[PDB]
Amino acid sequence: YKTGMDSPAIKCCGSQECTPTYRPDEQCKVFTGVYPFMWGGAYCFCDTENTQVSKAYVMKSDDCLADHAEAYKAHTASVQAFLNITVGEHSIVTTVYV
Amino acid sequence: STEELFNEYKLTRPYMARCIRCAVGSCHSPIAIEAVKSDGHDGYVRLQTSSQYGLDSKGRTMRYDMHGTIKEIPLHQVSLYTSRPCHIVDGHGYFLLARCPAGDSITMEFKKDSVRHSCSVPYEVKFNPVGRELYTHPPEHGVEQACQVYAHDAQNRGAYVEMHLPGSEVDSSLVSLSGSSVTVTPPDGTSALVECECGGTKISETINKTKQFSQCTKKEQCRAYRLQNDKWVYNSDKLPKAAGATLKGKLHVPFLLADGKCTVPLAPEPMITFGFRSVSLKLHPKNPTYLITRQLADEPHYTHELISEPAVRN
Amino acid sequence: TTMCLLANVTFPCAQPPICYDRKPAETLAMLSVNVDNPGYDELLEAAVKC
Amino acid sequence: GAFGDIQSRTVSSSDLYANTNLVLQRPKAGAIHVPYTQAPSGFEQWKKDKAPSLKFTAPFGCEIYTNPIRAENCAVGSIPLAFDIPDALFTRVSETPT
């Protein structure tokens, strides 16, 4: 699998909500009391009442095509031989079904 | 036809993200690491980094983001290592392909003039042998099993990652003080927006103008964001997002896991001693070697054993 | 066949009206609305080049 | 944590079942990231264990192959035969040595 993650929705002195998408195993949660930082300083000016939303989901990996395992069900097999018959110096080579 | 391949990472820019281990402590790094994949066999991993490769600010280059201004260096200045040094092979877009040994971490570093940049991540990198003989370094001669290694070209295949609007990267080198007020200087050809809390609730989008504001005394009360409508980023969790539906396209990923051929070793020939309804096996493995026996009757009684010492099996 | 969208103008996906070396963000907005598309790679490699 | 925590119906099904024990966690104070905690890849854990193939463990000495799933040369049972021979092949006695 490959846990995909959306970027955190941040609102300064606000309140977000959880809008689902029905992705596989799609968890979502809203976190309050957050003072995030960027590289160029702080992100909000509010001390409290800020809000960050985490959203994660499971999608399958990029190498799924060449690296996967096939789950099957088998029953009632079928036997099939490659005989080489000679009857009175007249020989054939034929796939017979048995 | 490489220019047809490279033309979709032209829509994107490198960014900075949070790396937990930097040269000194926890920083914001231009070479941050999103994921390491190690599922090809003979030591090839595929890093998704926060930098870009194969594009200029050109053949062998890393393109990174240094506090907004996009810079570049040659590829042979960048080195990475797990336990031993790894060997960078090629790069395309946000993705790098290296020949790495097994280890419990990845550390990428490059050296500028007097600033050393690094990013260590706790991402496990494993080495996967081919066949029933468990080596650690790929051999010199043997036979050739089929395998699955990460392909070395950047050919468009059916696997994608998802690109988005870059959000409001806040800055504070923009905002400065006047002698009595607060002064915001957005850069040329780039619109900023300013949110303050010195009157009631104040907000503005400004363009190309050194725009002062009255009633704000200290510049701790004003946050000057930055805006770029073009130039996609990756859907990273280390970046904040924009407002409204967020989605702008998808790009293909280079260096996917393809079927190939790999050389595997060949164990020294066993010395077989025969007896009445019995067979003895003298075994001198050079490196650990699976012995697998079974009988050709209705009960196979199969035996499976990793042998790594000189051993006699009857 | 597959027809792509920028407006109510169903243009052929191999023949886009815009290219990235002309417009910085209008091509990205044209790719934005057309993500759910089986001919998105055709629109992609056509929407780069003129 | 085991085999089949991802279940895609086909390789290009675009609707996968996923039960990977994903739980979102609270972010660190002053940082923009999405922290999660989930059980590891059950496909990788299946690959680490992997009791050996049917190519090495099959009774009667079969030879399991892949592209049609088939076994080869299983020395078990016996094939009966029916010969409906026309009367023209039966040469007379004196046209053969004796």
**Of D38, A39, A50, residue with least CA distance to B30:** A39
Residues 6+ apart with CB under 8 A from B263: B138, B139, B141, B142, B143, B144
- Write the DSSP symbol of residue C38: T
Residues 6+ apart with CB under 8 A from A42: A35, A36, B170, B223
Residue B204 to residue A22: CA distance in whole angstroms: 37
Resolution in A: 3.5
Beta bridge partners of B192: B206, B226
D52 to chain A nearest CA, in Å? 15
The CA radius of gyration of chain B, in Å to the nearest whole number, is 28
Partner-chain residue, chosen from B292, B296, B302, that has the shortest CB–CB distance to D60: B296
Task: Please provide the DSSP assignment of D4-50 as one string.
Answer: TSEEESSTT-S-EEE----EE-PPPTT-----EE----HHHHHHHH-
B153 to chain C nearest CA, in Å? 18
3-state secondary structure of B9: helix
B9-40 burial string, b = 16+ CB within 10 Å, else e?
bbbbbbbbbbbbbbeeeebbbbbbbbebbbbb
Residue A40 to residue B239: CA distance in whole angstroms: 13
Please name the chains neighbouring A, where neighbouring means 3+ C-beta pairs under 8 angstroms. B, D
Domain range spanning residue B132? 3-167+251-262
D29 to chain B nearest CA, in Å? 13
Q: Check which CATH number belongs to the domain holding B66 and give it.
A: 2.60.40.3200
Residue B256 to residue B155: CA distance in whole angstroms: 9
**Of D10, D8, B248, D13, residue with least CA distance to C40:** B248
Residues 6+ apart with CB under 8 A from B30: B14, B16, B50, B51, B64, B65, B66, B117
In the structure encoding, which two tokens stand for residue B267, read together?
A: 């164990």
Structure-determination technique:
cryo-EM
Domains of chain C, by residue range, sit at: 1-50
Q: Do A62 and B159 touch (CB under 8 A)?
A: yes
